[PDB]
Design a protein around this ligand. Structure first.
Ligand SMILES: Nc1ncnc2c1ncn2[C@@H]1O[C@H](COP(=O)(O)OP(=O)(O)O)[C@@H](O)[C@H]1O
Ligand SMILES: Nc1ncnc2c1ncn2[C@@H]1O[C@H](COP(=O)(O)OP(=O)(O)O)[C@@H](O)[C@H]1O
Ligand SMILES: Nc1ncnc2c1ncn2[C@@H]1O[C@H](COP(=O)(O)OP(=O)(O)O)[C@@H](O)[C@H]1O
Ligand SMILES: Nc1ncnc2c1ncn2[C@@H]1O[C@H](COP(=O)(O)OP(=O)(O)O)[C@@H](O)[C@H]1O
Ligand SMILES: Nc1ncnc2c1ncn2[C@@H]1O[C@H](COP(=O)(O)OP(=O)(O)O)[C@@H](O)[C@H]1O
Ligand SMILES: Nc1ncnc2c1ncn2[C@@H]1O[C@H](COP(=O)(O)OP(=O)(O)O)[C@@H](O)[C@H]1O
Ligand SMILES: Nc1ncnc2c1ncn2[C@@H]1O[C@H](COP(=O)(O)OP(=O)(O)O)[C@@H](O)[C@H]1O
Ligand SMILES: Nc1ncnc2c1ncn2[C@@H]1O[C@H](COP(=O)(O)OP(=O)(O)O)[C@@H](O)[C@H]1O
Lengths: 215, 205, 212, 212, 212, 212, 205, 215
């Protein structure tokens, strides 16, 4: 189902994770040490130069629905591989882009998805930096947001009704997380300890106010 | 409030985003072109060698609560900068790690947060690969999913997940009534057991 | 009608020749000295970074039916330029390829013709090495060929009927070149006159063997 | 009979072609991969530093009538090799020139032929660019050209007279790989039949404009 | 008992000395010549890259109670090695610091002792420069010093009283490798006999000025 | 009285210390930042290229009894400076040697003392490694030694007569150091007080073994 | 009249000497310090890259009858310069050769004289080593030699070399009379057979 | 009698010449090819690192009256060698200097003669350049010079008395060279051909005038 062609910082991580999730993954790399290191983290692992057409055929690359081209540094290799993958009619080709220029040729040679990992992680880090309290969020509208909050101290050993969040800020607490054991829909008396995960829902400004005052 | 010391693929992105969100950001880089290119995407932008102690002082680096050290490639420069920042008593120092080794010294020289961008994006991509259907998620799982013209009672999700919202036309139905129509381009927000959601995906979609 | 984007060993030569032939040519280069040096050998010459989209627009690059991308060394620049040219709907984009890899991306980003100058000149040189008599040829069939021959000592000061080629080997001499003045169709052939022969490939080859 | 000293874009092409033509060729290169890659495209292939006199002797370089020095980039290596080849009394030494300067020393150290591949390919491309539609051409003079050309359909030589109207002589017709060498006044030209035309460049170009 | 990781001006000296003192020492260096040169001045000598974890294990580095990291120039290598040594639970890790910065990371990665050889030798030289003529000295405080010193000849401790006049206590006399440990008031001091003196630095310096 | 010519890790340290001791010191360096940084740690500080004879004259270098050449890396500069200093009749020229070779030329061009800082610090470190108890020592004979010891936990809060050292091992405690204030000659010894012992080497070593 | 293109150990020495002799010399070098250092030892001194054709034209290089190409190390630069000089029709081009190979191309690109300084100085040193006694010589041998208070008749050199001169006190006795005293610090100039002179050295000295 | 320690452009030339003159020469070099190449041009040739004291002893370096240190480039090696040679009490140590600095230390470590080959050849070339006619000269005084002249053409096929040089310029022609066969003291009728070597003596200005007019 999945082949990952570059086992580096990025490709290796995709590989390890797909495998941990339970999908079958073919790990490909030109470097023998890398292939050895990923033997345990992939269904199969093979030494191959992904820029070599017969080597790609030998991997049985067409038997794959998704091929990820994760060779970062070598722009030539990356596009040459992508080029070959498009020739072999691969349904989904995802490629890591090195820079603006690399993005542009990948776009034209028919990459299905182009990833800028650092750029994307930049946004995520900035999101983290601006509200440290928020671990995760989902934007429902311009105005509404579901927010996973890490409990700052003053919120310690307090029940739902202790700070009633429906009356005060007009937000609904969706869950509590204690010990990797969750309280899915809390009763009015359920204790929130420090470092429990609050899941809160409603108006963005109301949550932000609750953060300002209850934390 | 924020200073970003390396304006590259990673640091530049952090900078541009904080600025876009409305925070004030000092952009620092050794390279003049980079500093020029980020003039518009930062409150202030200054040429500086972040490994030079007097240059850091000159930036007024202590007036900052968060300093991000985003010079990727040069492991020496990165740790030397971090080292200097810890000397100047910066409250929060976030550094991009190049490899395992780099992580280790940053850990010991008192980096407050150490980021492995590619590693982290790997996980996120694998999540995406594994279920192409989800737009956003929060692991507690709450899942934003992208059933046409069917009500909430038309498919009774509790009988074991709870539909939290519908998005039609950038107008959301926050907690839907049992007879609220879901169209095709619509943003289901679903909550509960991970396997139950996956099953709902398999069968209702 | 023509724009040449890289004025180097290759691009400059194309430019100089189109101009010498009487066509109008826009010469483009990033380097100011190159642009200065080609001022006399082009209708117009402009400093421009061909990888910069607004700079291309400013050249009025769309007013051109043929754009030649001759930037040799920089594979990135070459393909980025080609990419931009294809975006601007240029009807004919001809690019010099650096290597196999370069050829492949140019092929996919819609280059209309891809030139390997050294590769092609290799063939021509080997042709030249193999029979030092010939200078140019056109293949009509598997059997027939028009051949431009450089004359040896052996047919020096000879007329057409001195070695009658229609009888002896059965080829028709099409022209003689004496001093950049051509006898189109008893005419004396001097050494280093260009013989233009036509007919059967083997007959010509025999005439070479015997008359030269 | 032939040795090619630089297997590169240029030298490799000369080698591959001489071999394909059936001549015996010794391929030489300093780089082992290049030598391996040309094993199949040469009579013999050997690793050698062509700037090293004893290595040249070991190749049996004197047993060769033609040595091609095709190392492009390294001007020093190129001229040092040429220099050594001239010492060993090689009858024909052909060298690829990198620039004007390189040409000049090669000229003085007794290179028999000096090739500028890109320069020469420039001219050929410009010729192609000027008249696309002549599948092939041979330049006789500045003024005169033989042109292979691809309304004309179902018309004879008498019905379309070119000696009078444009002043050009149709040399041949090609119908399905079966050529009419010198057409009788009534011979039918069908679409896609190869016209061979000869005479004044402007007259041909006019005939193209009007008859096509 | 001891391993020395950098055989250089500094590390080599530590190695040679521990060996000369009779301790067993493992000498490590990446450079084969250095390892060869220290074969005679160490219990064992091994080629190893001290920044490579498996190579460290192979040395049996944990069997050592003291590891000295003496690679001067390469700050990266130095700290990476130290880092690995701290991972392997070495009880005592002594490292040569290159500069202030280097000191700081070594401090944080748990170096047990950090040496600045030139800095420390600076102090010792300045001490020598200040008072040349004290063959040897030990600094007790900023104010107090024990001094070995080389008019004084043929005079006793009673004839030259130092407890009263300068306020210093003569600790010993050395006559021909045969020492008078604590001199009786009448013991003769001959020229070139080693005076040991103790007390206030300025008092000694005054005694030097006047009695010598 | 003293000039220091290289203000680096080594020279700067000598300079700072002579100044701290109260001597007057001229600090010289080619680098302006170094000269600025040592303005506070020297009587005078001057920018000068010590390899330039007129620059040396301008410093009034002859007015000095001791010149220290501390330029480490640049062997040429170091010896050229030393050479010039010997020409100007300087009474004492002390130079830091980079390597064996450097030592040899300095020896011949009349350096009065040649220092190998790292080599010398190596010995001192090995001494320290071998017995972690001691800090400083003076060798009186083959048999006798004055030793500065750093106190362990075992003699913490003990008086002189608590472990009477004159009876038990037969050594005389010369001083105690508590907090940079010294008890020169029932006095409590706390941990990290500096013991100053004197007598037989083996007796001290025994006292170390048993009392610590 | 003379241009010297490389002001190094060799070219600088040629320059300084021609100037000292009184000829006018143009000193050329790519390095600004060298050009500065030779300002006093040349009629004119100019910064120029001698491998650049327009720079050569700008020097007015054609106004010169002799151009010396003295860039030692860089064989490429040396021959490229020589090549350009031959194009500009310079009447006399003298070049320092680096090795055998360098000699060969310079020979073919039309260098008028090719100098191997070290090789040539080798011969001269060996001459000096072999007979330490001679101050100067000319191989036809005429020998300047550095017998106290003895006349020309006191040692009859013809009975088989001819003493050409004596030097006392920077006052020379051009062709000495048979009774002319030779002192110790005196400059004998002797002529004839090489072996005869050597023998005279062996026996009279 | 002579040892040459560097067989390079300079040292090799000294070696080859001393040998050609008939003296016995020990050629030393660190490089084996150099030692092989000079086997024929020296009495003995030995591989040695001249900076290594025991290697010098092994050569029997003290048995030599003259040692020439001709390692050009490596200033360290050159001075270290010289230093060792001075320790071994060599009577004459001649060293090639690389630059001003090198000269200075060699001077102090007791080099007996210091040679700057290029500098010296510079002077000789400039002498050649300023009077091309003169091949060789000896300065007798400020005013007087013996000059070896190469016959320029107009001097062709003329006897001594044809241009009487004692009357005209008041110089005495000392010799003629035809075919490496010399006419030592020419008779008044001896023919001078082009490319014969004129040896002329007398006043510097008179010779210079004779050059101006007879050539
Ligand atoms: N032609 C190729 N075929 C297969 N794998 C390749 C090829 N070229 C490079 N790689 C592999 O791609 C991986 C890229 O990893 P890395 O340089 O860390 O990039 P990233 O920073 O994106 O992880 C390396 O493990 C490398 O061995
Ligand atoms: N010593 C330094 N001081 C300040 N900025 C630096 C220093 N070294 C590098 N930088 C800047 O940091 C940025 C690193 O970005 P980049 O090379 O893209 O790596 P990354 O992938 O981590 O973003 C560059 O803009 C670079 O100019
Ligand atoms: N980004 C660019 N835009 C426009 N012209 C360029 C750019 N990059 C290089 N060039 C020009 O293209 C030409 C390439 O010539 P060259 O490298 O000699 O190739 P060749 O020898 O094959 O013609 C140079 O004249 C250079 O100035
Ligand atoms: N000293 C040498 N002896 C023999 N072959 C050489 C030497 N130096 C370079 N070569 C070969 O000459 C070839 C030059 O080819 P290349 O650089 O592609 O130029 P071009 O593109 O003009 O052919 C290279 O394949 C190289 O291996
Ligand atoms: N990675 C490494 N592992 C082991 N030894 C090393 C490594 N890198 C350098 N060394 C050795 O450390 C020594 C450092 O010595 P040197 O450069 O003289 O510094 P110092 O003068 O301070 O001793 C060198 O001999 C070198 O061979
Ligand atoms: N020609 C010179 N004249 C005067 N000072 C010099 C000269 N060359 C170098 N220096 C100075 O000598 C010092 C050498 O210090 P450094 O290289 O750190 O040696 P170390 O670390 O052993 O003290 C530097 O401060 C440098 O500025
Ligand atoms: N391309 C060039 N154009 C002009 N001058 C040059 C060029 N390259 C080198 N030079 C100068 O020529 C001189 C060479 O001198 P040097 O290196 O001492 O060699 P040598 O021993 O032949 O004198 C230097 O002064 C150098 O700056
Ligand atoms: N330590 C050494 N002992 C002996 N010979 C040496 C040593 N170092 C260098 N040489 C030799 O000295 C010679 C110097 O030659 P070269 O570099 O041509 O100088 P030059 O230009 O003066 O001739 C070389 O042949 C080299 O092998």
């Amino acid at each position: 189902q999945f082949a990952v062609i570059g086992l580096g910082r990025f490709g290796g991580s995709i590989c390890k994770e797909l495998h941990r999730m339970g999908h079958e993954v073919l790990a490909v790399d030109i470097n023998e040490e890398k292939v050895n290191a990923y033997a345990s983290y992939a269904t199969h692992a093979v030494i191959a130069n992904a820029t070599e057409e017969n080597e790609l055929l030998s991997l049985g690359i067409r038997n794959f629905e998704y091929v990820i081209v994760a060779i970062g540094a070598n722009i030539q290799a990356s596009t040459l591989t992508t080029l070959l993958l498009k020739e072999l009619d691969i349904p989904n080709i995802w490629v890591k882009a090195q820079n603006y220029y690399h993005h542009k040729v990948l776009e034209k040679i028919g990459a299905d998805r182009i990833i800028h990992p650092e750029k994307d992680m930049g946004v995520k880090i900035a999101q983290s930096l601006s509200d440290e309290n928020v671990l995760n969020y989902i934007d429902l509208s311009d105005e509404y947001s579901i927010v996973e909050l890490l409990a700052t101290r003053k919120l310690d050993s307090k029940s739902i009704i202790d700070l009633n969040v429906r009356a005060k800020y007009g937000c609904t607490i969706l869950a509590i997380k204690h010990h990797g054991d969750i309280c899915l829909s809390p009763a009015p008396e359920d204790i929130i300890r420090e470092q429990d995960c609050l899941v809160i829902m409603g108006h963005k400004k109301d949550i932000k106010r609750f953060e300002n005052e209850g934390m």
